[PDB]
Amino acid sequence: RELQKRKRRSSRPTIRMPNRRKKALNPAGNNIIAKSWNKKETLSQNYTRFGLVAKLGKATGGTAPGNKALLSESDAVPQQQQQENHIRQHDLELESKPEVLRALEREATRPVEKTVRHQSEREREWLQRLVDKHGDDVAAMARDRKLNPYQQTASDIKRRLKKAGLL
Amino acid sequence: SEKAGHQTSAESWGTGRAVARIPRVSGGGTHRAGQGAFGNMCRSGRMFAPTKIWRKWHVKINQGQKRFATASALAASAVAPLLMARGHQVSTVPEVPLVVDSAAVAGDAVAKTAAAYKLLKAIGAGPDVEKVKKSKKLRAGKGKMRGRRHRQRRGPLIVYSPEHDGKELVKGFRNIPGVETCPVDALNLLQLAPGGHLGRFIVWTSAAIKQLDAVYESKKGFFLPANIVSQADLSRLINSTEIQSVLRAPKGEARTKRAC
Amino acid sequence: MKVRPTVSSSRRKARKAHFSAPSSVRRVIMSAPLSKELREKYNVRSIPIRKGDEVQIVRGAHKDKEGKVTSVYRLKYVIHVERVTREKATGQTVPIGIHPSNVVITKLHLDKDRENILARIKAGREQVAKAKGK
Amino acid sequence: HFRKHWQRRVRCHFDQPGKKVTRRLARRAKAAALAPRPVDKLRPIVRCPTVKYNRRTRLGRGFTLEELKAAGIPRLLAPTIGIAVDHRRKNLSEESLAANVQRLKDYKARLILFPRK
RNA sequence: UUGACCUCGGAUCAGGUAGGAGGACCCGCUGAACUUAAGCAUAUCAAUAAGCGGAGGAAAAGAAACCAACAGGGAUUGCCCUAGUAACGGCGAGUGAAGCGGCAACAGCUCAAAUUUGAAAGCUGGCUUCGGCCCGCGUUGUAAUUUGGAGAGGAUGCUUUGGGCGAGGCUCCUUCUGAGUUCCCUGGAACGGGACGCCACAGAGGGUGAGAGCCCCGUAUAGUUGGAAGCCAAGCCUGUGUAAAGCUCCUUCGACGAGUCGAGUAGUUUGGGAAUGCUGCUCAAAAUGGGAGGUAAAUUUCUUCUAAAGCUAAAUACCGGCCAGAGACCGAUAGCGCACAAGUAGAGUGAUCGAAAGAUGAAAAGCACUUUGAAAAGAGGGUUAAAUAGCACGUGAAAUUGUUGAAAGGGAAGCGCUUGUGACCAGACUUGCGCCCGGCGGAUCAUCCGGUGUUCUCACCGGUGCACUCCGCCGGGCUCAGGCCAG
RNA sequence: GGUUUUGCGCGAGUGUUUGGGUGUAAAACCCGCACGCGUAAGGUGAGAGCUUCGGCGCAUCAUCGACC
RNA sequence: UGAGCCCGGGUCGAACGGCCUCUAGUGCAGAUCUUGGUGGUAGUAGCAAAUACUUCAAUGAGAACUUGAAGGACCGAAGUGGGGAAAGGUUCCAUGUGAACAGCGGUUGGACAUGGGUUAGUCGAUCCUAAGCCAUAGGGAAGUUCCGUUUCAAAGGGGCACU
RNA sequence: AAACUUUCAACAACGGAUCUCUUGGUUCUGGCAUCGAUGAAGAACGCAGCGAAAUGCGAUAAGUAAUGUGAAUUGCAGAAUUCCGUGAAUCAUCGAAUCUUUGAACG
Structure with missing residues (x-):
């Protein structure tokens, strides 16, 4: 209170704070969503146009009429009606409509490069010395001590030779 | 403020002194010393029953009664006599439930204010528009100090269909004084019965009229109320053949000759 | 109707800002309209007043008195037009404070800064005129 | 029931519509970022514990490792x-396992997964 | 003799760090009484006020030694109900949760217990040519790997990849963007009244000599000029080392926190002697272990977790800080003590206590000059729309006082009813209506025809009707009705 | 927080406003799941009111009942 | 009927009212009520002791209490004297004013306004310790901080030497 | 008859009510997270041509540098500005400086 009275009495200017916000309220960039997002609509209204789902949970109230963004067995094992011990781990082997959704499906299905990994210069030399001395005997290469000092298995040596194209 | 009249040190002098038993400020070097305090009768004292923010400012009203009132407000808006009784200049407009073609209000046809003003003049809502314009004058009282400087009359209310008319007519009608715009799916009794008085002049669109059946068919737990009377014309009921055939003969006249 | 949340409609705050404005702000408030000949020449409606301008008073007791601006007294929101004066008791002449909103500029004091001011206002006016036109 | 000093602990919810706008x-x-x-x-479908509520289902915290493996979704992904x-x-x-496995396969059918980079 | 190590010291040694303020909200310690009820005492106020210590934009809590008894749930936090329920109290005054359930928000992790042992692979300095060098710390353990709904090691086969620029973009400031000063009247001054216009995604607000959308600042929407710092990012350069990572399988392994649980006791606390929790003291553990719960179900079967190490955003609080927007609030004895050079003047040794006090005028145009007075001032004269606005300054009530005008007064005045005198006044009235003659001035006389509107039989327009009919005036006569007091 | 009476809505149901969704944005409009409170047939005599003049008999009271 | 309502005349200058609903910090003769202002008492009580004052002239608009001179009285070195400590803070000097204060007046003043005035190697402080207090070593205390003052403190000085 | 006491009226006083106004308060809501040994909060003394207070600043002292704007400040006096310009201003912004004695206060 005394500080506030002092400021009103002082000749120093008032530091008007601009309305800056920690989190942005609209998408930005050069992607499909940012180029189709309408700033004056709501979250559900924008997603309904996109053909996507905004909330995967339970509906907690009444929505607008047009809203579409808020959602033999011998062994008798229930899982038999669900099928189509190791699975893929970095991707999923996944199998009239709005423009945004159709554009999104095209970006997800666009073929991309892989950037195949090569082998080091010394690794090729170690492999080449192996094929020079033992030919195509992976079992002999594994048992060699001078040329295979890390005692790698025949299966691992065979796999590396295939990647190098040395059979 | 909770501390108004309390941030002082006062104590009653006692009973044996020939002065009122009221707390008095201690000290001795000011005009304030020895003055009464802490009382609602005392200058610079605490007020009686200080106003508190917990006062029940808002009122809980049944949704059924809210929808009943809106239905009554809409029905009274179709009654021509009630429109005049509420101060609306309805004399040059036909078809009191005035329905304008949605083709003349959808798109940029009305987003220009000059175009929106022209449409109101053509349909017959004109004289109600400059009625608001000529009625503006300064408020009487301290409301001027507190941000309510002027007051004026209400004009026509435009009810549209946002999904057919396109929500762009709102900006056309925004600047015109008195003219208020309201979507069909969300009607306001504060806008339908101003001041508690029924009979507001409303100009509809063709799309809004079609949607008006759908909006009341979608309200859950609400049906259109059934009145307690079927015919509201008392003259027809009393002067009907059924009633008059079973009545007794009159026992007198409106004015009776006094005998003595 | 005001829409942006940063705008205020308070009478108390508007009167405080107007009467406690700095000198730079007061220059904008002390603007005067341009004459009809100047409007069709520069495509500019108004401009802040300054010392060199020539004005014609169009409101007040001085009906249609013309003269050159002599002082821009920003501290009391008044300007001093030459030969628009009143005599004190002693007979010494003192200027009469005229508000810029009561005058119209007939001749404009020209310098590189004010040609830049007129060009910027014209650029905006022609931008929207063609935007509204087509 | 005002034997304590209630007046100094009284919370009035005059910011009810303000907080709703803030929440919205x-x-x-979040939609702007994601x-x-x-x-x-x-979230999975679970059964309420008590016999009062065991005839009704709701949403759980997360999916079990067993029912995630049966769907065909790796743990770390x-x-x-x-x-x-x-x-x-x-x-x-088996009833809880089958219900949530089917929920996951329905999620996989509707999914659009983009390439990593 | 010399030299290590350990421990402890010096230095204005090289580089750092803490204290104080603020404390609205937050984390702890400490800690009352007035009051309420009851023979008394416990209880209640209250696990509050005062006092002390410690943080932030939030803090705290937090990923079960949990809830449950289920067809199960699944870190923490908050709202709603649960619920004035359970439970504790002379079952007084009273006190008083929690699980489930609907919702807001959601996020998971790091160590200690292992040997890198085929290579301390780790890090603080300070000298630099910024290439790199030495001094040390540390094996009484710094890296990588693992953290018990796990994991390791091998084998096997798929799958996965890291750095540097970066156009441009978002956020925030910043420049510019509509229309009457047209004519008349009142007025000192139009921003008032009348007329004719214009703009409006702008008729919010303010100023300008009196109520201004168009006189001015701004107001609305889209753009547009320049800048700031964060974050994102199309693309472009590169990458590498037999380097890392996810899983699968198994004739191999799988370390999990002690003066801590617990028993006894004292104080305090809770709805909670299975002690609800905490603290002090005495004693002092375990490994198919330990904790909690269910259960008469025949023995203590069954269920559910893993304590004594640690980190973590969000939903939540906010009388304080930087701002911003509002009100059916108050309007100078009100509203904060303070609308003013107010925590000021002033009082007290001190801790502390603590006021009163806004308004000339649109513009000082704040009265030149003359005269009387020692002066203060007065009177002329003047400014102004106004001095019946002269800084003892908007408007200027009452108490109280002066002058003038009228009246009354032999020890109260004032009050009720009724005349009279004197002064002073509001009404009422001024003529209307209708007949009979005369002079007129004009065709909305009756009827008929056509069109139109309606209440479908009533009207209105146009024509015919160019005068014993109809309408207004004037000059006479008469009737009626007209104010006050009376016979 | 209880309680009595009057008006209003719906009525074996009632209560949107913790919250969510729109909005011209503290207004107004809408409602998915729980939740609070309540709920899941006789004889005789009088008796308002009907009557086809024969009788039919509301509510409520008295009595004999029936059931839990 | 009444609480009240309306109009006329005067003053004034910038906003206000009727109708119907909504709302409340909504109606005063009292509370030895609060704040402010104003009366009768009343031109009344009263304006004390320190024996004591008088004449001419000057200043000044104005002189019992301002000055010069003269007279009559007084303090009587334990003073009604001349200086300090403590305390006060410009009251000290000159010029000017007379709104307020000096319970009459004032031309006078410790009043008001405008200027001026305090000169040190030797006078005091500055240095020393006294009764006594504080820090450090340590030890209590939840803590703000308390004890502790030479204590089971590595606590302070100085010298010499063909290097 | 006057004087005195009382009543009313007009004018004039005393006093500051009433009406009107308000760069103030009070309450609610929203965005944001920023004191200090690089010396804070508080206290003191200086600084303007003419200033006591309030305000601003610190011996560079009602202020310096930089950026923007674009022609003032004003109570008086004195300088300006060439205006076709690194440039007035008790202007705004603000990233660089100066920053007396103390005060956690530190020879």
Whole structure:
């Protein structure tokens, strides 16, 4: 209170704070969503146009009429009606409509490069010395001590030779 | 403020002194010393029953009664006599439930204010528009100090269909004084019965009229109320053949000759 | 109707800002309209007043008195037009404070800064005129 | 029942509509960052414990490791593609396992997964 | 003799760090009484006020030694109900949760217990040519790997990849963007009244000599000029080392926190002697272990977790800080003590206590000059729309006082009813209506025809009707009705 | 927080406003799941009111009942 | 009927009222009520002791209490004297004013306004310790901080030497 | 008859009510997170041509540098500005400086 009275009495200017916000309220960039997002609509209204789902949970109230963004067995094992011990781990082997959704499906299905990994210069030399001395005997290469000092298995040596194209 | 009249040190002098038993400020070097305090009768004292923010400012009203009132407000808006009784200049407009073609209000046809003003003049809502314009004058009282400087009359209310008319007519009608715009799916009794008085002049669109059946068919737990009377014309009921055939003969006249 | 949340409609705050404005702000408030000949020449409606301008008073007791601006007294929101004066008791002449909103500029004091001011206002006016036109 | 000093602890909710706008803007902020993604995470279907409520189902915290493996979704990828994982819940019955496995396959049918980079 | 190590010291040694303020909200310690009820005492106020210590934009809590008894749930936090329920109390005054359930928000992790042992692989300095060098710390353990709904090691086969620029973009400031000063009247001054216009995604607000959308600042929407710092990012350069990572399988392994649980006791606390929790003291553990719960179900079967190490955003609080927007609030004895050079003047040794006090005028145009007075001032004269606005300054009530005008007064005045005198006044009235003659001035006389509107039989327009009919005036006569007091 | 009476809505149901969704944005409009409170047939005599003049008999009271 | 309502005349200058609903910090003769202002008492009580004052002239608009001179009285070195400590802070000097204060007046003043005035190697402080207090070593205390003052403190000085 | 006491009226006083106004308060809501040994909060003394207070600043002292704007400040006096310009201003912004004695206060 005394500080506030002092400021009103002082000749120093008032530091008007601009309305800056920690989190942005609209998408930005050069992607499909940012180029189709309408700033004056709501979250559900924008997603309904996109053909996507905004909330995967339970509906907690009444929505607008047009809203579409808020959602033999011998062994008798229930899982038999669900099928189509190791699975893929970095991707999923996944199998009239709005423009945004159709554009999104095209970006997800666009073929991309892989950037195949090569082998080091010394690794090729170690492999080449192996094929020079033992030919195509992976079992002999594994048992060699001078040329295979890390005692790698025949299966691992065979796999590396295939990647190098040395059979 | 909770501390108004309390941030002082006062104590009653006692009973044996020939002065009122009221707390008095201690000290001795000011005009304030020895003055009464802490009382609602005392200058610079605490007020009686200080106003508190917990006062029940808002009122809980049944949704059924809210929808009943809106239905009554809409029905009274179709009654021509009630429109005049509420101060609306309805004399040059036909078809009191005035329905304008949605083709003349959808798109940029009305987003220009000059175009929106022209449409109101053509349909017959004109004289109600400059009625608001000529009625503006300064408020009487301290409301001027507190941000309510002027007051004026209400004009026509435009009810549209946002999904057919396109929500762009709102900006056309925004600047015109008195003219208020309201979507069909969300009607306001504060806008339908101003001041508690029924009979507001409303100009509809063709799309809004079609949607008006759908909006009341979608309200859950609400049906259109059934009145307690079927015919509201008392003259027809009393002067009907059924009633008059079973009545007794009159026992007198409106004015009776006094005998003595 | 005001829409942006940063705008205020308070009478108390508007009167405080107007009467406690700095000198730079007061220059904008002390603007005067341009004459009809100047409007069709520069495509500019108004401009802040300054010392060199020539004005014609169009409101007040001085009906249609013309003269050159002599002082821009920003501290009391008044300007001093030459030969628009009143005599004190002693007979010494003192200027009469005229508000810029009561005058119209007939001749404009020209310098590189004010040609830049007129060009910027014209650029905006022609931008929207063609935007509204087509 | 005012034997204590209640007047100094009285909370008035005059910010009820203000907080709702703040909550709605926070939900919009999440959609701004996660533009194509939903603002929530997929949660399983669970049964309420008590005999009073055991005839009704609701949403749980996250999916069990067993029912995540039966669906065909790796553990370390599930929190990354918008699936909540709960390592504390056990199945204990085929009925809970089947219901949540089917829920996951329905989620996989509707999914659009973009290339990594 | 010399030299290590350990421990402890010096230095204005090289580089750092803490204290104080603020304390609205937050984390702890400590800690009352007035009051309420009851023979008394416990209880209640209250696990509050005062006092002390410690943080932030939030803090705290937090990923079960949990809830449950279920067809199960699944870190923490908050709202709603649960619920004035359970439970504790002379079952007084009273006190008083929690699980489930609907919702807001959601996020998971790091160590200690292992040997890198085929290579301390780790890090603080300070000298630099910024290439790199030495001094040390440390094996009484710094890296990588693992953290018990796990994991390791091998084998096997798929799958996965790291750095540097970066156009441009978002956020925030910043420049510019509509229309009457047209004519008349009142007025000192139009921003008032009348007329004719214009703009409006702008008729919010303010100023300008009196109520201004168009006189001015701004107001609305889209753009547009320049800048700031964060974050994102199309693309472009590169990458590498037999380097890392996810899983699968198994004739191999799988370390999990002690003066801590617990028993006894004292104080305090809770709805909670299975002690609800905490603290002090005495004693002092375990490994198919330990904790909690369910259960008469025949023995203590069954269920559910893993304590004594640690980190973590969000939903939540906010009388304080930087701002911003509002009100059916108050309007100078009100509203904060303070609308003013107010925590000021002033009082007290001190801790502390603590006021009163806004308004000339649109513009000082704040009265030149003359005269009387020692002066203060007065009178002329003047400014102004106004001095019946002269800084003892908007408007200027009452108490109280002066002058003038009228009246009354042999020890109260004032009050009720009724005349009279004197002064002073509001009404009422001024003529209307209708007949009979005369002079007129004009065709909305009756009827008929056509069109139109309606209440479908009533009207209105146009024509015919160019005068014993109809309408207004004037000059006479008469009737009626007209104010006050009376016979 | 209880309680009595009057008006209003719906009525074996009632209560949108913890919250969510729109909005011209503290207004107004809408409602998915729980939740609070309440709920899941006789004889005789009088008796308002009907009557086809024969009788039919509301509510409520008295009595004999029936059931839990 | 009444609480009240309306109009006329005067003053004034910038906003206000009727109708119907909504709302409340909504109606005063009292509370030895609060704040402010104003009366009768009343031109009344009263304006004390320190024996004591008088004449001419000057200043000044104005002189019992301002000055010069003269007279009559007084303090009587334990003073009604001349200086300090403590305390006060410009009251000290000159010029000017007379709104307020000096319970009459004032031309006078410790009043008001405008200027001026305090000169040190030797006078005091500055240095020393006294009764006594504080820090450090340590030890209590939840803590703000308390004890402790030479204590089971590595606590302070100085010298010499063909290097 | 006057004087005195009382009543009313007009004018004039005393006093500051009433009406009107308000760069103030009070309450609610929203965005944001920023004191200090690089010396804070508080206290003191200086600084303007003419200033006591309030305000601003610190011996560079009602202020310096930089950026923007674009022609003032004003109570008086004195300088300006060439205006076709690194440039007035008790202007705004603000990233660089100066920053007396103390005060956690540190020879």
